[PDB]
Amino acid sequence: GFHSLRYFYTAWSRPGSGEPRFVAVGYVDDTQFVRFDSDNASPRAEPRAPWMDLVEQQDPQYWDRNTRNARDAAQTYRVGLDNVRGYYNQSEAGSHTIQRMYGCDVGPHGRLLRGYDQLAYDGADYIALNEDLRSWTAADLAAQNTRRKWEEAGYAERDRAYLEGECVEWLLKHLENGRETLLRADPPKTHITHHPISDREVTLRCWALGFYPEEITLTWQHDGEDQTQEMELVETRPDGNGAFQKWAALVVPSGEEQRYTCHVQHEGLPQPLTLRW
């Protein structure tokens, strides 16, 4: 069905403690497949998914080309940090960060649904390619400097040729080569656990484990009445093996456990689950 190829750049200065650093990662959907770290001796792009490490027979030039591209990108944003700090006339003794996220969403027909390219400076919106893939939105006065530079270099056109072309074609290649990983819909392993607080109260904790993709809905319900304001819902977290975990817990009175149900929705499930202690 639908899917996304997304690249994440982080560049930041380290005044006194060394040269700026540049770290880039790429994801297909919720799976990371590539990294690049400028702090290596001779930095190269590196595979981080099983289908990369073992199916570059398709394109024996992949790593040469991507190492070259990430190296050039690293140099660009190192320069960019100085340009941007000067737009704000910030002191050179403070550390500053540029981030970029760009990529493409494809639909089930294998055509572009939307392309995007967004930048942040020090954690706030700085400049973004508009949805026409033709103009830029600059978030403040300094970012208009970058926009004018980018308008003059005709850079929206290059951005967009990449997003409608290479991005789409590579997303589709990764999905085929990584089909075992990316087109799985592993449903969660679910169970409830039970932790007495006192003689009068107990915590019920509904667990979802090992699932992919990351999207999931966990709710507790009290005999029809939903408990979204009563429960503690933890942020979804990576398991470390390519999948995810989540739980929702609820304090209930002792003796009442049987009246509460946990409801789990995930696209790997044939039907939603209902758990009861």
């Binding site: 690049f36 050039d72 960019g80 270099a153």
Partner: peptide, 10 residues
């Protein structure tokens, strides 16, 4: 692929 840049673009 990573996108390729053009010298310095910022």
């Amino acid at each position: 692929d990573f996108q390729e840049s053009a010298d310095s673009f910022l």
